Amino acid sequence: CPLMVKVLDAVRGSPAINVAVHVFRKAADDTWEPFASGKTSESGELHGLTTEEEFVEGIYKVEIDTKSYWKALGASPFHEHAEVVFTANDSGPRRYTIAALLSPYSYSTTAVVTN
Amino acid sequence: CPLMVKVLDAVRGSPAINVAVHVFRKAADDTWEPFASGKTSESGELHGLTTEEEFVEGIYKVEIDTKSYWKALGASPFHEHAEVVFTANDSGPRRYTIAALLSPYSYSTTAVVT
Amino acid sequence: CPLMVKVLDAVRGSPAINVAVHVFRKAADDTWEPFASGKTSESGELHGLTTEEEFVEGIYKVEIDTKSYWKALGASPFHEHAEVVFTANDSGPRRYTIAALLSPYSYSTTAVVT
Amino acid sequence: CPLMVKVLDAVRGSPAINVAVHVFRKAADDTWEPFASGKTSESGELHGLTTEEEFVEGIYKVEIDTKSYWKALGASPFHEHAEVVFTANDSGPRRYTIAALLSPYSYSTTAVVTN
């Protein structure tokens, strides 16, 4: 599994469950084409998004929408979207893990490249 | 000033100077229309992007070009930019300050409204 | 002002007002000696904690009392405070700005030196 | 395993390996007594810190020192220490996971309480 995504909720302190996450790859003319997508499991992770064969170097974007989310402590009209754009490079390690921590008016994201 | 941006560098514990920032607004046909852009000052701040009249209601995307910043420092960054999409002025005018904290493999963005 | 503090509330997208902050300095016998304290303003800033002469070289601990802040808003916080320990003025005087971003179950702290 | 600790490196984008992490519990007179400690594994995690029987409600502190760390991209005289103080409550979920993301002049931490 070359690309994994982990989503956490910063106000409830739990995994972000049943959250839709989309992954796009940049096209030649600079369009974003759909690459892979799914919904986070009960541990806030999303596995089997792609395979080693399909995941080649290029520019990818991981998008997470927090609109539906939060009827928890803080709802807001902000409608924040996490947008993580990065370049997959065959030079560094093989496996990537993208983590996103969500709040109503903020979000942080990190990348852990192992193996 | 209704829309300000502030960038901090968590590697050298200083403001992020000369960073390029682009702001887009979502068009009726789902495309992203250029709205405003500029670069941060020596204090890491970017003011005067737009005015009260130009900043209408809508879905905006703020892109901070972190890759160029880290490479010009010798670092090997993971991300192309630090981005965040949000809805603004949905209930009349408000003042926004988007603040970003940067590291080679991580970043966060926060909004302070009015 | 050589030591400033700035706190932001990521839940309501505003500065964190009236937040208590304590600063300690590590004593020769490893105990933590009270150094300065105060509360953030309506802008979420705390200035005038100390002066250039009082702020000597040493290991300081800045504690932001987040629990009291979240409970007074009705939230159920995880942490007692947001804390961070660091070494200061080890190479002559410098100006520090510690900025903190708060959420009920998470927080970050960043330092901007001179 | 009631209390787990995960440490990540924000400049190298990898798990923080062989990092010493200490856990203290607050004593009656407000002293901090040693509770548990160890060194992060090759995946940046630390397991088997304590047991359900030993981990009762109270105020705990998880400390991580970044002094030795970083002969990686950015070394600094800052000598930052992550200090995560929290109260364990038997009301919320049973398992706690404390995550810490380190940088030379900054750090963020989150808590994920499950089950």
UniProtKB/Swiss-Prot annotation, chains A, D:
Impact when changing residue 80 to K: In AMYLD1; amyloid polyneuropathy
Tissue distribution: Detected in serum and cerebrospinal fluid (at protein level). Highly expressed in choroid plexus epithelial cells. Detected in retina pigment epithelium and liver.
Post-translational note: Not glycosylated under normal conditions. Following unfolding, caused for example by variant AMYLD1 'Gly-38', the cryptic Asn-89 site is exposed and glycosylated by STT3B-containing OST complex, leading to its degradation by the ER-associated degradation (ERAD) pathway. Sulfonation of the reactive cysteine Cys-1 enhances the stability of the native conformation of TTR, avoiding misassembly of the protein leading to amyloid formation.
Superkingdom of origin: Eukaryota
Result, substituting residue 36 to T: In AMYLD1; amyloid cardiomyopathy
Record-listed Phosphoserine modification sites: 43
Mutagenesis or variant effect for residue 24 to I: In AMYLD1; Jewish 'SKO' amyloid polyneuropathy
Function, in words: Thyroid hormone-binding protein. Probably transports thyroxine from the bloodstream to the brain.
More details: Tetramer dissociation and partial unfolding leads to the formation of aggregates and amyloid fibrils. Small molecules that occupy at least one of the thyroid hormone binding sites stabilize the tetramer, and thereby stabilize the native state and protect against misfolding and the formation of amyloid fibrils. Two binding sites for thyroxine are located in the channel. Less than 1% of plasma prealbumin molecules are normally involved in thyroxine transport. L-thyroxine binds to the transthyretin by an order of magnitude stronger than does the triiodo-L-thyronine. Thyroxine-binding globulin is the major carrier protein for thyroid hormones in man.
This protein's name: Transthyretin
Full protein: residues contained: 30 to 144 of 147
